[PDB]
Structure formats: structure tokens, C-alpha cells
Design a protein around this nucleic acid. Structure first.
Lengths: 114, 210, 59, 148
RNA sequence: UUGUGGUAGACGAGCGUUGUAUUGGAGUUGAAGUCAAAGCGUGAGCAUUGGUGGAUCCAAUACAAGUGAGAAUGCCGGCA
RNA sequence: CGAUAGAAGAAGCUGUUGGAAAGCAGCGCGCAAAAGGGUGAUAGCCCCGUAUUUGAAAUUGUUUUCAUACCUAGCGAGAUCCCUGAGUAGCUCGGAAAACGUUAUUUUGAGUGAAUCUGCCCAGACCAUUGGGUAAGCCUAAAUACUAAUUAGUGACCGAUAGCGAAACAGUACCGUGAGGGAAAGGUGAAAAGAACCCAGAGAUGGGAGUGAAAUAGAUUCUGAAACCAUAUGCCUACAACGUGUCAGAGCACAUUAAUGUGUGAUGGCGUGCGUUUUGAAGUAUGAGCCGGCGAGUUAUGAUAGCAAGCGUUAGUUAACCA
């Protein structure tokens, strides 16, 4: 009983090739390199799913501090301003967006002065 | 219950015969039945599958690749299973066991329970030699019987002990039905047909023999 | 099935396993042992659990 | 079960795959260590061989048989507890063949044994008898013929 | 609630491929198969449509795999 | 009672598309034969063949009977009449086979060497009694395996990488003088029914034309994948320290297997391949030019362990063998 799986093997290799494409050189035109790049891309995506939220947090912290220095206040105390007194739940990203909102962050900074 | 005979045109009789309570089994044992089906299935292997092993191939025993100064495997054999020469080192073998040790009590229990549940399935139909002799072997009368029985998607078997020549001349031009001797039947073949006609005489023999 | 004669000449099967064998250090001689050990090694022995496993597949 | 349906209940249990990579589990490794002689094919040194270490049987004395070259006589024991399950008198070879005791195409010497007390008188035929067995049977007042 | 990191290794649940008897079906009003697409599944896979091809295939249940291909200075072929 | 040329051998029309119907649908028949094959796709009614009835000049296998041979084939009374397998059995030195590595048993390369049914041999040393048989000449069908094959049938046998190397003119070619090694490739079409016509050119070749259902059917001839080589829609790049990608993403061009739509990306954050051993390689540890196809834990017997099942109340089970 001769079992032949050439068609199934080619179908498998073809779908694995179609998983990823768009590479310079003969990296997307070779099945083994294609699957290696798929593995590396999945690992990269997981790495991003962690370090990019780490980024987003740090980036908003930096952006908020940059605006805060303009009005004459530091990030370290301003975050504490909402904490020790005037206990609010506004998030740093939404406050960062509200900085650009007209006559909005002025209300925010005058409300914390209880 | 009771069971009566159907004529060639589809005229069932008016005097059926009572089914004795000694031909019904209150116990169901599917595992011996399934094993009988498997061993019947384990009879379609002619053992024709075979391939040449490492020592069975007709080729040079030299080393195609020398040990050093070659960037390939050593491989002191010309033909190998991983090569494209042909043959598998183990491959299919023509000496498979195909042997299952039987249990006579289990075999008899399976046989009797399949008989009883075929009787209880109500698909059984009475038949006798009185009509087996009245036919000529032409399947035209068998065609009338089948259009009267209106059962073609299920194989119809006739457990027989006499095997009249007229009866056996049919059941071949119509691939749907078949005729089989009482003892020669098998559980796998019995459930394959699932439609069956029984002689009035063999009921007592089946009951006594168990 | 063949039975390894190299071993079975020294071990005998008993009830519920517990294969019985003779104590060593005495078949050649026991010239430097105390009578206590000699009469206590006169009793026969049984292979350990791992030894029983190894004998079982051996036979 | 029919032509289009042959489902089992609990059979055809899980097997092992030794060549389907690690997405299937236990591929090239094959569950046999690494770089060891026991890892190599056709390894698994003899049941009496311990890989250089002296075999235990090579360090143990060898049994001696007084009945060397000879064998025990085949006395079939008639245990009194189980022979009491079936009820039958005038016991003989003509009955033992019917009672699934002695072979129907050969002659075999018989032995009586047991420890269960009974009282009904029977008729018994054996070639060997035990002390407490004969005591128990004679308390039953039966007849035993120690074949002579 | 512990969790869901965990090699060796222990253990569990599976998927598909073919033929084996099926219940069934489609097909010169287009089947297997090929290429693509901007689907469904965690995944073994299945689609669906479009193009060639003009003649076989598959859905569901057990059977067996020369069954499922990542390396073996793996084999052959072709192309650099 | 058979084989080797052979004869008979039965059951269909209509409509549709479809190149072609044989498919499909409606109305019938009929099968000892609805096994098979091919005949324009999926033909019970196209055919044979099929099961069956038969036929054989001549070779002619087997069996039975008869005529003809062949030996075959009864019970008694004696007689130590002669005899019943001679270098024979044995003994001794080294062996061989016997489960045995030499012991009961056979033989001897060498030497020696009896006996006569009363006696002799055998009864795992030998011996007493006792039991069996009388060696030391020959032969035999039956149950004995196998296929170079003649033939019939079947393949959970393979389908041009497989299957004997052997589907093509394969043991070919080729190689070593010589032992020997020993490959490769099949498929048009439906019937070549092979592209008439016309044109460029020296023709090959190619193109319109036509047949052909179809020239995605043009002889590199069922189909014709990807890697590889090119062409063009758009995107950007010739100031750029870069495992060459990921998460996003302006801008550019679009509108989909209708889904926060997609292709691409100036730039921002991060951004030293895989398999194997070594505690341990980004590894300058090693293997890989790329791609496609093949490619490596199976079989028997027996046991053990796990699960399940059957059966049993002295259990299960048949080996071998026969239908």
C-alpha cells in the first residue's frame, strides 16, 4: 500500500508561505526561511504587546510632564496633587488629550487648587 | 409475536406463526458482536503488500560516497529507504498475524443475540420451500417480489438449508438481494443485509442449537 | 518461550512470587565468619523489589 | 452498529508518535535520553548484564537437586473443599471424565487432600491420601479406596 | 481556589489523507487538481468565489497506514 | 472423466442540453448471464463476453473393468540335524553425531577381536532377575517443499520518483580489457482527421486563414505548480551605520471574500536565524545555493503492566487435523 502525500505537503507549504509575505530578498520566496520569519514575527508581536504598553505609559508620562513644565509644575507633584487631595480618576492619557482641548485643561488645573 | 409469508405479488397470508419466547434474548453484548464484525472485516487482506528491504534489493554493496573528502553522508550502501533508489528497509510485511483467538461461549452468545434482535427487529419475513419450488430461476418473478416487498436499498437474504436451484439462480441479476445458507451467514454479513427471510422449519433448529 | 538457565539454576519460584535463593559467601567456604552469621545465613533469601522486577522479565 | 456507523465505547487507546516532531510530542528524542548507549538503538543490555558490574547470579550459589534427571509423579489432587461443591457418590474415572477432572484419553494417578469437615458417606478412589484428609473423610463415615 | 513558565520526561484530547461496505450527493449547466482572493477555526483543517482542466470526487462512523516532512556535511531533479 | 482450433448464447425507444448522451428525465423489456472491457463524458438494452448448452479429424492426461502375466496364501508329529546377514558385536588410543562440549547409543583413523537362538543385542556406566527383538543384504508409492513454467482466477498490490534495473528495443547505453557495476525518459487528438490557404525570410521558424467542440488540442503533444528569469498599475529610495522585520504610521493609489477596508510606506519605539551537543553560542561550534517530490520506531512469536469485555460457578480454551 503506497501512500503519497505530495499534494497535501504542497498545500501545507503553500498556506505556510501565504501566512506572511512582503520581505526584501529571498526570505519570502523560501518555505523554511518563510516559516522562520513567521516564528520571528510572532515573537516580535508578543514582544510588542508588552513593551508597547510599557512605551505608551512612559510616553504619556513624558508628554504630560512636558506640558506641565510649561505652566510651572512638575509631573511628580501634579500626579500626587490628584492623589493626596481632590481625589479624581481621570487618566493621564485622557488628561494628555485634554491639554490640547480648548479651555479644558485650564479648568483641570484650577480644580486641583482646592 | 407472529410472522406470516408474503407471496410473489405481495399478498401476505392470513395465518401467521407464533414466535416462541425461546428465540428472544434479554441480554445485549455488543462487544462480541463488534469483534465478530472486525474478524469478518479482518479477512479481506490477501497479504500482497511487500517491498524490498536493505538486503532484498539487487544493487552494488560498494560505498558510493567515500569516507573523507566528500561533503555528503558516508552511506556505504547504494540504495537506501531515504534514497530514490526504491524499497523500504522495513516496508509492508506479508506475515501479519491476522489471528484472533476465539471464545466459543462468547461467539455463541453474540450469534444468538444477533439472531434474536434480528427476529425482534421485525424485518424478518417468513418463507418456505413451497414457493422456492414454484419459481423458475428467472429474476422477473423476483422483480415482482421485490417491487411487492418494496425494499431495495437494504440487502435481502434468505437463510436456507435446501438451496433450491431456482432460488439460487436469482439474486445475482438483481444486485440488491442474495441467498445464504443458515450456518454460513456471519454477523457482519447479517447486519450488512439487515433484511432477511427465514424458513419456517429452521426456527426450531436455531432455538435448540442456540 | 525459552527460560534463561543461567539464572533459574539458583532461584526457585514460590507462592505469590517471593523467588527463593541461597545465601552467598558460603558455597566456596566461610572460614572467617561467626557462627551467628553462619546459622543466620543458613536461611534462604528473596530478591528485592527491583531485583524481583529484573528477574521477572528475565524469566 | 451499521454500515455507516461503527462507533466504539472504550477501545483503540492512545498510541505513541516518535517521528512527528514536537508539535506532536516526542519526536527525534523518542523518549530515550540523549547521547547514551542505552539511547542507541539495539541497546538495553541483557537482563542479567548490568553494564560491567558483576551479575547477581554470578555471585550466588547454585541449587542442587536430589531428583536430578528424574521428575515427580503426576498426582492430581482432589481438594476436599471444592470436591464438596459438587455432590456425587461412587466416584471413579468413569465419572471423573464427566466431572472435568481426569483426561478422557489417558490414565492419571489421583490424590486426595483437603481440610473441610463433612458427614455424608461417599465412595472415593485415589492413589495418595493425606492424614487430616482421611481423618475428615472417615469422620464422614465414607469409603475411600487407596488404590493398591 | 491553584492556576494556565516549565526541558528531560510522564500524561491527556484531537485533526486531516487515501482505499476498505455504507447511508447520500454532485459533476461537458464543470469533478479532482492548480493560481489568487480582502473567510472560519488556538491549531491540526474546512470552506466559498474567480481562472485553467475537460472527467472523477467528497460529507458523516470504525479498519489499516510505504500517512502527515526542518535540517541527517539528508537522496534525486531543476533552477541560479 | 479432460485439455489442446471452435458453435450457440437472451432484455429499447423518445425528448433535452451536451462536440458527442451512453448522462438526465418519460414510457418498457429482461437477465443460468446486472463479472469485464472498450465503443465521442456516467451505455443492462453497441457489441461481444458472461452463466449455460455443445462440439474435437489427430496428439491426447487420469480412472475402472476384462484377457494376459508375477509372486502371493493353512494346520499337524519330530530333531540340540544344517542354518537364519563375520573383522560382526565388542575391547583400546584421538574424534564426529546424538539436547550433550563424547556418557547410556552409531561409526572408526589405528590395533585387537567373540559368540551361537541354549546364544546374542537392547532396557542414558555396568550387572542379577525379568521384558522386548534376533542385528551385522536390498527396495518402496502416502502425508514431504518448490515453481523455469502451460493455463484460469484474485488482489485494503503498486501506478513512469513506485512497482523485478527492466511500461521506451534494459541488462540498453556507459565504464573497468577482466571479476562486476549498471541508470534516464509513457501519455496529441476522437479519428492526424498533423495546421491546406496567404505572408516575411535561404529555409528552419513565426504569424494571420481554415479544419478541428475546443489549436489553453500544433507534435517540447491528458494538466502543466513553485523556486528561478523577465515585463508592466501604483509606493518610495541615489545624506545613508541598516537579522533588512515588528507595533504604529504621514503621504501616494485604490474600493474588498464589506470588513475598525486594502496595497505601499518619509519617519517614531524596539529590533545579533534555525536543528544538535555542551552548565552554556548571536556564534568566528557546526549543516544548509534555492525550490519541488521521496525520506527514517514496523512484523511475528511469548510474557508483563494498564483499561474494557465475554464467560464461569471447578474455569476459559482447542493446538494439530478435517468440510
Amino acid at each position: 500500500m503506497r501512500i503519497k502525500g505530495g499534494k497535501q505537503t504542497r498545500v501545507r507549504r503553500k498556506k505556510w508561505l501565504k501566512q506572511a509575505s512582503g520581505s526584501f530578498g529571498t526570505r519570502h520566496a523560501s518555505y523554511k526561511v518563510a516559516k522562520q520569519t513567521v516564528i520571528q514575527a510572532a515573537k516580535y508581536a508578543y514582544r510588542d504587546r508588552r513593551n508597547k504598553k510599557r512605551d505608551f505609559r512612559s510616553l504619556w508620562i513624558l508628554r504630560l510632564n512636558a506640558a506641565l513644565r510649561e505652566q510651572g509644575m512638575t509631573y511628580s507633584v501634579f500626579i500626587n496633587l490628584l492623589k493626596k487631595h481632590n481625589i479624581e480618576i481621570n487618566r493621564k492619557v485622557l488628561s494628555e488629550l485634554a491639554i490640547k482641548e480648548p479651555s479644558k485643561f485650564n479648568l483641570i488645573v484650577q480644580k486641583v487648587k482646592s | 409475536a407472529k410472522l406470516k409469508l408474503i407471496k410473489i405479488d405481495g399478498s401476505f397470508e392470513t395465518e401467521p406463526v407464533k414466535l416462541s419466547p425461546g428465540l428472544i434474548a434479554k441480554e445485549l453484548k455488543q462487544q462480541p458482536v463488534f469483534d465478530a464484525v472486525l474478524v469478518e472485516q479482518a479477512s479481506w487482506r490477501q497479504g500482497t503488500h511487500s517491498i524490498l528491504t536493505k538486503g532484498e534489493v539487487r544493487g552494488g554493496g560498494k560505498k558510493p560516497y567515500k569516507q573523507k573528502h566528500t561533503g555528503k553522508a558516508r552511506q556505504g550502501s547504494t540504495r537506501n529507504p531515504h534514497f530514490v533508489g526504491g524499497g523500504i528497509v522495513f516496508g509492508p510485511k506479508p506475515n501479519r498475524n491476522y489471528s484472533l483467538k476465539l471464545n466459543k461461549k462468547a461467539h455463541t452468545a453474540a450469534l444468538h443475540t444477533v439472531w434474536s434482535e434480528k427476529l425482534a427487529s421485525d424485518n424478518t419475513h417468513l418463507v418456505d420451500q413451497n414457493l422456492f419450488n414454484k419459481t423458475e430461476g428467472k429474476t422477473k418473478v423476483m422483480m415482482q417480489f421485490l417491487k411487492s416487498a418494496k425494499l431495495l436499498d437494504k440487502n435481502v437474504l434468505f437463510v436456507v438449508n435446501t438451496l433450491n436451484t431456482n432460488l439460487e439462480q436469482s439474486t445475482s441479476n438483481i444486485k440488491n438481494v442474495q441467498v445464504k445458507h443458515l450456518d454460513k451467514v456471519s454477523v457482519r454479513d447479517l447486519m450488512l443485509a439487515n433484511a432477511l427471510l427465514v424458513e419456517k422449519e429452521v426456527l426450531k433448529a436455531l432455538e435448540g442449537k442456540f | 518461550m525459552k527460560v534463561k538457565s543461567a539464572a533459574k539454576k539458583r532461584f526457585k519460584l514460590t507462592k505469590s512470587g517471593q523467588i527463593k535463593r541461597k545465601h552467598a559467601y558460603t558455597s566456596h567456604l566461610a572460614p572467617h565468619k561467626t557462627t551467628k552469621q553462619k546459622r543466620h545465613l543458613r536461611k534462604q533469601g528473596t530478591v528485592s523489589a527491583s531485583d524481583f522486577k529484573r528477574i521477572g522479565n528475565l524469566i | 452498529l451499521n454500515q455507516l456507523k461503527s462507533v466504539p465505547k472504550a477501545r483503540n487507546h492512545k498510541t505513541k508518535t516518535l517521528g512527528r516532531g514536537h508539535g506532536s510530542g516526542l519526536g527525534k528524542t523518542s523518549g530515550r535520553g540523549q547521547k547514551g548507549q542505552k539511547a542507541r538503538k539495539s541497546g538495553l543490555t541483557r537482563p542479567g548484564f548490568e553494564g560491567g558490574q558483576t551479575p547477581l547470579y554470578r555471585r550466588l550459589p547454585k541449587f542442587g537437586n536430589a531428583r536430578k534427571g528424574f521428575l515427580k509423579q503426576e498426582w492430581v489432587v482432589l481438594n476436599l473443599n471444592k470436591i464438596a461443591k459438587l455432590k456425587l457418590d461412587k466416584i471413579n474415572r468413569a465419572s471423573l471424565i464427566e466431572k472435568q477432572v481426569i483426561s478422557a484419553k489417558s490414565q492419571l494417578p489421583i490424590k486426595l487432600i483437603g481440610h473441610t469437615k463433612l458427614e455424608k458417606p461417599l465412595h472415593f478412589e485415589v492413589h495418595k491420601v493425606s492424614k487430616q484428609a482421611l481423618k475428615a473423610v472417615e469422620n464422614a463415615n465414607g469409603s475411600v479406596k487407596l488404590l493398591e
